[PDB]
Amino acid sequence: MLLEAIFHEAKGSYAYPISETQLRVRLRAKKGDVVRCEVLYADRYASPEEELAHALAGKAGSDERFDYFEALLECSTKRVKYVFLLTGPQGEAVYFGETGFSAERSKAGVFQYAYIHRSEVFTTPEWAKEAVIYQIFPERFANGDPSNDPPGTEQWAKDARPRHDSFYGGDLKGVIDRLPYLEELGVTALYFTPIFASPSHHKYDTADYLAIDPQFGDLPTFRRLVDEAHRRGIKIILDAVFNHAGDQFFAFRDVLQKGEQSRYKDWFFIEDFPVSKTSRTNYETFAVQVPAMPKLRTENPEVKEYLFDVARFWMEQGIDGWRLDVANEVDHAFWREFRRLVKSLNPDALIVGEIWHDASGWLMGDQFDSVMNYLFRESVIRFFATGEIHAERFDAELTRARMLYPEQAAQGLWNLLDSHDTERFLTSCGGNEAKFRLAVLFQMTYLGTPLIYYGDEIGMAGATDPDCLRPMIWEEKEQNRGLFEFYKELIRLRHRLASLTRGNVRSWHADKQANLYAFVRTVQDQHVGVVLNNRGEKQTVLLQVPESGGKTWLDCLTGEEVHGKQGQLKLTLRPYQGMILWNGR
């Protein structure tokens, strides 16, 4: 075995508590090097001669190059020291501890998790653990009030092909009028892109953090929406841009006018004075040279307090959470204090960040609850849409991503297929609904929070921005009601099957040849096996099913009953068919 490829650390994603007296521990090793992983542990102050407790670390998964083992240590003292005992293919017994590797336990030393503080157990909102989020781009969802429509508002038709500066009149009143549609779909939360006052079409350059943009509505209307949504079992999540403000931001306008004498000059990153000019910027902004988006100095206590007051104000309106853009460019102290503030005002308020790279630094439990799962989207696009990867690669990509963060974060990552900045997933599938449906079936049964992009549920298509921002199809005749019913059915199932929302994930089958992938979601005694035949061909597969997990299953989508024979389960799937097998527990 390659000892240099074995990894563990007593913190982060490899050692973390799931409760005050339970510590989850993970170990990584070159694929195939470790056949058995056991943990020997005890209280940190325990006598040397004392018998050590034992915990077997089952193989939680495997990616392209590594195997992952996971164990749970029961630590009534809330203090624990531990060493790993690894057995290789040849029965070699290797101990692994903080000191290193050795054939002798005492020489391997022990990893230590000094203390488990209840305040350090990663905790996320309970409602968020079984949610189905719906992303609404206000300008294009529903025009409920034509009196606030901006000049140039185009016709709201299905054949409408939006331009970069098009206007259709979508607003908050429109969302309220369409709540019965959303309730029928079964969504439990609405995620809105920026709706705060801004002079641009995208509103990522905030002019007033304390006002709804006039073209969308006013405060009285927002309140109505919050209340009407809540009485429908639908929460509201607002997108906040705290990394930078717009050039119309009161503080920035003051600096543009007074400059050196501006009381807010230190709220931004200004190189020289005058603070700006036409086509030229001497201050730090979002990305590169974006004058309309001056970066906010969140490290400045005054800036931090101002934004915290902004958060306070909107939460007072009854919102249920925040989605943060460019979160990775705001400091960690700001995020740690933001969480403290938000959770104190409402422990059920969700905090989601947008970070396009490993976000472990923000997912330890003291900052965000979760982030956008862009890895999930990439894997699903390549497997279901473009066919760039096969079932085994798909399996490896999902597993690797799953092991990135502590389970509390992974369980609530927002699993999106597309967004306001990408082409529609149906379009990624080249219009193939069969492929589209299999990806949705997977989305609704996989680990994480499903996120639906407005219109996808009724068959809307489109290229990336701005063609992905086409007017929502409200004409039932123009809607793909068959797909709508498909979404509805999957959502109902996810809510009834505890394992789909709170279960763990384990790969069941992965065949690169047949391109068939299966996994099992498990919660307590309940097992739900999802079988995906991602191939334009009717195929048969023989899955392993030990009697311990059951001998009979029910396909929740067809009502077909299947039985196992001698630890094997024979299944026949039609082109791109997906099965959701419930073990009756």
State the catalytic residues.
325, 354
- Check binding of 169 to Ca ion (CB under 5 A): yes
Q: Is 456 in the site for Ca ion (CB under 5 A)?
A: no
| 333 is a site residue for a copy of itself (CB under 8 A) | yes
Closest-CA residue to 173 (of 142, 201, 152): 142
* Beta strands 280-281; 370-371: pairing state: unpaired
- Cβ-based nearer residue to a copy of itself, 305 or 485: 305
CB 576 within 8 A of CB 533: yes
Number of neighbouring beta carbons within 10 Å of residue 184: 11
361 binds, among Ca ion, a copy of itself, none (CB under 5 to 8 A by kind): a copy of itself
148 touches Ca ion by CB under 5 A:
yes
> Exactly one of 70, 171, 213, 239 binds Ca ion (CB under 5 A); which one?
171
Among 59, 79, 224, 232, binds a copy of itself (CB under 8 A): 79
Report what 487 binds from Ca ion, a copy of itself, none; CB cut-off 5-8 Å by kind. Answer: none
> C-alpha distances in angstroms, 357 versus 79, 335, 362, 472, 528?
33, 17, 11, 31, 31
Say how many residues touch a copy of itself, by CB under 8 A: 44
Residue 149 interface partner, choices a copy of itself, Ca ion, none, CB cut-off 5-8 Å depending on type? Ca ion
Q: Left, alpha or beta for 21 (phi > 0: left; psi -120 to 50: alpha)?
A: alpha
- Which H or E element spans position 495? helix 481-496
Examine residue 358 and tell whether it contacts a copy of itself (CB under 8 A): yes
What is the rounded distance in angstroms from the CA atom of residue 291 to the CA atom of residue 282? Answer: 9
**Residue for token digits 């097992």?**
527
Residues 168-207 that bind a copy of itself (CB under 8 A): none
How many Å apart are CA 521 and CA 457, to the nearest integer?
24
Q: How far apart are the first and last CA of the chain?
A: 40
Does 11 engage in binding with a copy of itself (CB under 8 A)?
A: yes
Residue 166 lies near Ca ion (rule: CB under 5 A)? no
What's the 3-state SS for 533-579?
ECCCCCEEEEEECCHHHCCEEEECCCCCEEECECCEEEEEECCCCEE
* 67: helix, strand or coil: strand
Identify any residues that bridge with 579 across adjacent strands, giving them in sequence order.
531
Query: Is the separation of the CB atoms in 232 and 179 below 8 Å?
Result: yes
Q: Which does 561 bind (CB under 5 to 8 A by kind): Ca ion, a copy of itself, none?
A: none
- Site for a copy of itself (CB under 8 A): which residue of 91, 278, 288, 548? 288
- 329 belongs to the binding site for a copy of itself (CB under 8 A): yes
Report CA Rg, the chain.
Answer: 26
> Which among 58-66, 139-147, 384-392, 424-432 is the span making contact with a copy of itself, rule CB under 8 A?
58-66
Contact 486, 440 (CB under 8 A): yes
User: Which residue of 33, 98, 149, 254 would you call a contact of Ca ion, by CB under 5 A?
Assistant: 149
Interacting partner of 103 out of a copy of itself, Ca ion, none (Cβ under 5 to 8 A depending on kind):
none
Give the residue at shortest CB distance from Ca ion: 169
Say whether residue 177 binds Ca ion (CB under 5 A): no
Under the binding rule (CB under 8 A), the answer on residue 5 touching a copy of itself is yes
Tell me which of Ca ion, a copy of itself, none is bound by residue 357, counting a contact when its beta carbon lies within the kind-specific cut-off of 5 to 8 angstroms.
Answer: a copy of itself
User: Which of 22, 30, 127, 466: binder of a copy of itself (CB under 8 A)?
Assistant: 30
CB distance 33 to 67 below 8 Å: yes
Q: Does 89 bind a copy of itself (CB under 8 A)?
A: no
d(CA 73, CA 59): 16
- In degrees and rounded to multiples of 5, residue 321 shows phi and psi of 170, 175
Distances (CA, A) of 68 to 33, 57, 242, 446: 11, 9, 37, 19
**Contact positions with a copy of itself (CB under 8 A) in 363-402:** 366
Which chain residues interact with Ca ion by CB under 5 A? Answer: 143, 145, 148-149, 169, 171
Which chain residues interact with a copy of itself by CB under 8 A? Answer: 2-5, 7, 9-11, 29-30, 43, 45, 64-66, 79, 98, 100, 110-112, 114-115, 117-120, 287-288, 299, 328-333, 336, 355-358, 360-361, 366
